[PDB]
Amino acid sequence: EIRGVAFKELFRFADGLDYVLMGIGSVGAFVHGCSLPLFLRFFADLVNSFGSNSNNVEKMMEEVLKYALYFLVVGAAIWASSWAEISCWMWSGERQTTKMRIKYLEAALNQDIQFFDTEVRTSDVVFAINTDAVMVQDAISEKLGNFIHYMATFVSGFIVGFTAVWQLALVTLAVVPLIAVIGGIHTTTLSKLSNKSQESLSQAGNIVEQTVVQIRVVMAFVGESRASQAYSSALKIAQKLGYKTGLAKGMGLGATYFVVFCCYALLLWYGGYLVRHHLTNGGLAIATMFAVMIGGLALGQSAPSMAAFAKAKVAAAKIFRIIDHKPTIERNSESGVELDSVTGLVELKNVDFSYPSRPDVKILNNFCLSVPAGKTIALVGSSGSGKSTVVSLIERFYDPNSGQVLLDGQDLKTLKLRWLRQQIGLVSQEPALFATSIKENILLGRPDADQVEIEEAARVANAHSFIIKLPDGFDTQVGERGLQLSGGQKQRIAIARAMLKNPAILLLDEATSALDSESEKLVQEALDRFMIGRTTLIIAHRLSTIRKADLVAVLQQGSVSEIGTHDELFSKGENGKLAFKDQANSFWRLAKMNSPEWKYALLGSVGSVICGSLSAFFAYVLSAVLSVYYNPDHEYMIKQIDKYCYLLIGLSSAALVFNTLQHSFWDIVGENLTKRVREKMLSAVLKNEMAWFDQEENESARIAARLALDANNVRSAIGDRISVIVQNTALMLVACTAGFVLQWRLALVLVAVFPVVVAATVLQKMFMTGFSGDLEAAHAKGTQLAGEAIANVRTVAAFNSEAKIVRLYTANLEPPLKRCFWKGQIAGSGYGVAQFCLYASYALGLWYASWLVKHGISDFSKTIRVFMVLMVSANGAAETLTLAPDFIKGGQAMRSVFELLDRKTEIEPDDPDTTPVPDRLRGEVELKHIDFSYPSRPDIQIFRDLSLRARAGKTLALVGPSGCGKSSVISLIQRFYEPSSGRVMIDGKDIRKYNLKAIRKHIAIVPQEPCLFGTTIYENIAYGHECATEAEIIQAATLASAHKFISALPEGYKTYVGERGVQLSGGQKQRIAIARALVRKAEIMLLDEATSALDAESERSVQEALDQACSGRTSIVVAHRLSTIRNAHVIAVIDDGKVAEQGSHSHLLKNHPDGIYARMIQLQR
């Protein structure tokens, strides 16, 4: 394998326009990166002009106007540079990516079947088509532009810092690694603890998934409380892990706050020292500190670019490996002969095409097809010596081992290999349709034909009137994924696309779509009476296409057996808008649910406020220090700077303490809330009906994913998100108050430009995240078509529609190209306008500060303090606004959770108050006039007003046929599916009114395909009773003949078992389920087919265990029970739920059971 190619090789599909776009985007990214430190330098110059000229009001006003003009120039430069970078990079990346997808699909479909058998697999090719978005649509589309932009920012910030104040820049460059390593430690610890918590949540999801896959026994054996308790224990483990995670996150980010505040205290003291020694200015000091931080952040932000570049190198190496391979199929003449008789006879001296994956195996040894012209020849044989290899031979897949295949005295190997393809028709087992129009999915057989030939191609063969009468319309883009759910329409569309093709050398490889409907009847009229005759190796049915064919040509052991007469039989084993009032109500309900932890939240809230306030205070101090930088009194300057540094150290200590407090307590309340939510969701789902678990969207994997995702989503929505909202609200409040009390009418101006600043900063955050959306979703349709074409590469090569598929792929990928260009242009223009308005607002604020100072309304100190404090307030508001979409997502998860919780259940496992039940029952049950009881699929209605009787202390051994409601009478007994017309009376009264959980504690079951959950067989057996103890388990194991086999292993009771455990035999788990049913010790017992596939001694042991269970008390056994039913008084015999005579095993009345019950026994004997 290859670990990657050269980075430049990723640009192999860049034409002149792509080169121009890349150059323009690179220049724009470089200038946009350099602009921000240049703006810091210009801010330093403006502040120096605005503070150092306090006495000369005219000079400072003129210089402030000049530097506001420079701010406008920088804003325009950022506008142009960001527009260029974003739009050009996105467009060039999209163009190169689309060119690569087109070329890759063409190259892949141009290869032979060998390249997808022993070289790169079909799944690998589809995955490469998927991850072309990851490779080229990501790394060189925008990540390259971001890399250039951030490297430019880093270099420009370093240059600005080291040209303004090199002393302060050097000490700041020394400082930056401290914050970097503190943040790295915090991120590492947080990621590790989050991974551990995620593993705990995954284990909890495994627990709930195991609960719902085995819901049939969990509901029956009143194990819902046990499952809830186990889930709660797992959730408590995950909650302790989340507590550790929250404490670690709070401590780490409080350490970051403490370190940055202390470092700013040191840097501000050193800047005061530099101003005191007349080395530089205060504005220069602030700007050089900020510029070195911006350079450090820029250098840190180019790591994702390098990660994307490495991933791109490896994935481009893969894609180039597929593309650059020259197919061996086209190494032949490709132009030899294309003028042969349409009625051709394929001759095979020796069969070949031993697949290159396993060249040692020779499935086809030696035989000849010797097909008749105009007469249909069939083949049949075993699966191991299959017939599809003959199809591969005929279609010239170029794998000749020893012999050679030739058509009517002309070698296929030396043939054109182009004309042969349309000469040879094909309808394989797979329909192999494509995500394109139905007309195209037929037209691709003969491209030159118009709609008319398509019409008679779909008319002569099969019926196309379904398409005409299709509610979608005359033309259809194969619906969504496939036109037909059944597959008959798919097969007949394939037949029509072969009809536009030449059927001269037709090949029909049967149909694996389970067609046993009128689709086969229509197939009888399509390509079963066609005038010519060639290989039709249909083996779906014995008489289908074989009885009518004049040559059976049975194939076995890679050689043709007796051929010609079809009368002889062949031995084989073949079978034959959205209102937010509802969201607010849901949030209030969730908060009421989270009442017990409100106190904790409140403390965390307090911490948030403090931290919020702290930030403002810090900004204030910083701005205040700047005012002290421009002060003629040196001693007063030193005293004020030292006071501010000490206050800032105190702020750092408070920031650490209250950050740990806020985040620890907010994560504590979030963990408690998500644990409570998960527990309530589990209770709600376990309170539902069995039909609810039957539904597909409530599947086990679906349920686990839904629960985990919803809980995680709301957790964030309620934790760090609300933390940040409260913190930023406190910051904004404190900042506005400080600005207004210092110098109003300028804070009013900054509030006037407040929306501009918050919008521009939100767009800055978006740019940091990335402006290109979901790359895979953008090319979803083209990716789907490419994957379908790759999976059906055999059909594409057979119909010679490689060019048509590639052209359809270009037509599918053009709209994403146009959309990406337009999105890039809109994003670039919007981002540039936002930045220009931001810098215009900054210039306006500083000029208004100058105007207030010149008029004598205010002073420099108050103006600069208000300005900086309001700017940090705007930054906090930006954070809140950019976190709003997570609030939207959390509201969606919240309404999902509260629609799951508030769903009502028809059946109540834990009834509030019902008719009390005695400790021991009689066992008599009457299922009078029962019905199908299957809401999920009401198409079928079994139990046509059927009634069933079970006398107290007696057994029923009903047998029935397969799929006659055999395994559903017990479901009616346990109230899994409520019978609408059925009266199920237990102990003389209906089960609907007694305590359901109490009865389910008094009825045992041995389900068909026995449930083997848990980790140890000991717990599986103990599941039968709450007070399992040890004597009960031992006696149950002994009674059901389940003690010797378990003790055979050294582990015995404490043995690894379950879904992830060691797989054991069916008889062992059946007897384990029987032992669990016995240890349940129930008056009414329900059995199933516990003898599906067992050896002689295991069969005898299972029958003995069943005999003992029946001898115990009242029981219902529904197994086949061909003999030795222990003389049940009655046996219920039914035909699809209809009323029928109850033929007994002893055959007292040998009239009804003679033709039903005894027939299967005679057949098996």
Ligand SMILES: Nc1ncnc2c1ncn2[C@@H]1O[C@H](COP(=O)(O)OP(=O)(O)NP(=O)(O)O)[C@@H](O)[C@H]1O
């Ligand atoms: N790509 C492959 N690599 C290796 N062995 C293969 C491959 N494709 C098919 N086989 C083997 O080919 C043998 C014969 O089956 P084959 O004729 O290919 O298909 P089939 O589905 O059995 N045909 P049919 O009987 O007409 O339905 C089997 O033993 C397969 O394992």
Ligand SMILES: Nc1ncnc2c1ncn2[C@@H]1O[C@H](COP(=O)(O)OP(=O)(O)NP(=O)(O)O)[C@@H](O)[C@H]1O
């Ligand atoms: N999830 C389901 N949704 C709808 N119908 C179902 C579902 N599962 C089973 N059925 C049908 O409900 C009926 C139950 O037949 P029943 O004999 O009780 O079970 P079975 O497992 O089919 N028995 P058997 O064939 O003897 O092993 C049959 O018509 C089933 O096909």
Ligand SMILES: [Mg+2]
């Ligand atoms: Mg086949």
Ligand SMILES: [Mg+2]
């Ligand atoms: Mg069953």
